[PDB]
Amino acid sequence: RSTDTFNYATYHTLEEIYDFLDLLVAENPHLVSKIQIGNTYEGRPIYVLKFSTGGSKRPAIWIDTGIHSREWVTQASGVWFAKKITQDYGQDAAFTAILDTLDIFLEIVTNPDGFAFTHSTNRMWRKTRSHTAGSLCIGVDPNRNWDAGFGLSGASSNPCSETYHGKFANSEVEVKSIVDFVKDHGNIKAFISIHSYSQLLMYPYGYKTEPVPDQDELDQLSKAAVTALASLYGTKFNYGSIIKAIYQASGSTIDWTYSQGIKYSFTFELRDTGRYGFLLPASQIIPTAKETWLALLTIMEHTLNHP
Template sequence: MVPLASAHHHGEHFEGEKVFRVSVGDENDVKLIHELASTNQIDFWKPDSVTQIKPHSSVDFRVKAEDTVTVEDFLDQNELQHEVLIHNLRNVLEAQFDSQVRATGHSYEKYNKWETIEAWIEQVTADNPELISRQTIGTTFEGRTMHLLKVGKAGSDKPAIFMDCGFHAREWISPAFCQWFVREAVRTYGQEIHMTELLDKLDFYVLPVVNIDGYVYTWTKNRMWRKTRSTQSGTSCVGTDPNRNFDAGWCEIGASRSPCDETYCGSAAESEKETKALADFIRSNLSSIKAYLTIHSYSQMMLYPYSYDYKLPANNVELNALAKATVKELASLHGTKYTYGPGATTIYPAAGGSDDWAYDQGIKYSFTFELRDKGRYGFALPESQIRATCEETLLAIKHIASYVLEHLY
């Protein structure tokens, strides 16, 4: 038995918790789920809030151990079709750390805590001065440094692609991908023709973790935390959903004005230090940034604008074709199937997202990735899937980058 630091990962908080998947049929089913959510503490995994549930869809949610019987009875009595995705969340969370890599420090095939990632940022920059430079773009609410890596061969007036990971704290596979991308960039530069060309002609701005405070909190206190860790007067509830905090139809749809909700849009657009730092950086580098890529999990989707409205972007046909080709490229490695399309119809309407905001700033190629899986593990994706997930996602990112290079504007 591998000794798992379960206490430190707070696995014990999740003993007996279940994750259900309910098939929602008609409007009455939607009403029933709303009823259930109003009487029980339910953590929605997908969609991320009860308000986003629509007819003829499925909904994944986590239930506290003491409520599982009540919830199960409610689903049965109302004849709601359902299955249990995870029978005991504690077991699955402990089993996340199944990597066979015996590393004490940083590993690309393990989930790394923030202090390890921060040390890695320094190390990878120091080891690859000809390909990587780093800068500080801001600090978090709790005072942590937001490091941004610039990956590419030095050159003047190079077009750039901005990519961020770790918006939502519990989506651990996301920061894992940003680290993987940087490693593959420096490892294959000068070896692999495509990566070499990309780094010669483009710069990649990589923000390894956006929501650092939240990420730290998922390692120390609550693995299922999603939001930032900011506080404000007038409420004891903590945190804002950083991906509802951008000035793009801010708080109009699919976001909440209640500070206690998982999709709380914040007191104003860019109220969070983290989102403001990201937005400030992009605004000041708009002339060079040609694509914006933001990495989330889970559900295996590639989304493009808009999410804050049912309108389509001006270059919808182009984005749709690019997304189609990209998910085909992604699937070529392990057969992983992604769906794609505009955010509002493909997943659900949600205002204040960074992808819509970046697009409205004039960045024509703006995409959100929802990485593995489709819900078998959800946010508890095991480390043994990091390699395959990152390998296939890298193919997708390289495909987009090549396309952008051929379609500069």
């Protein structure tokens, strides 16, 4: 296989996505690199792709998919995104402008133990796979484990719950690896965490109703990103703060990244709105990724022009 002969309209295994990363690197040795940022609870490597046309820790966009493993359209879109970047660079003028200044980091399998578990045992696995003493239940909600209103209303203390927060913030190696990488990088200007489903583009906060100081700008960017998105197939996304647009969620990702000074902190909930939910047909992979790419571009151009 090469990245040109790879099937992007199909859901893949952990081993397949991991081999895809290696093909991407070998085919673009002056564009793409693969960074290991940790290992999972179970010992699997956690890998981030860096797309860079030079410099030393340029201002950057971070994008992660697959934090909740069952959300398959997200890792699939993540693969598509990688190949879109390499095809489009040096070819598309607008996108070439983005990558002549910014680096892009892309974490395709952000919850690898879960992902592997969605394949071997339970298609609907959400959480990490860390053990919990005195419980018949396994794993922690990676989207409740960040140090931002951690433990507060909007997560569960019950190990059996889908939204169990863990013993303390960053207890999950899968979250702390991202935290460590982000803090050490120091130059991340936008952070985008990709989930499915509901067709939402959101900004902070999810833990409290109080609006973020950059609300007008973030909301205005949100409206243009979903307008761009809708232009392709008419797909309707709603937007707003996590708490107003879906529900309260504590110790969630963009609440943390935003309080770290990363202004352009966003989360997408992709297709659909419930018909298939997480079980989205493979035939909707590429449409999903393509329309979401239009939204990502909107946000990345904004980031480019607003230091």
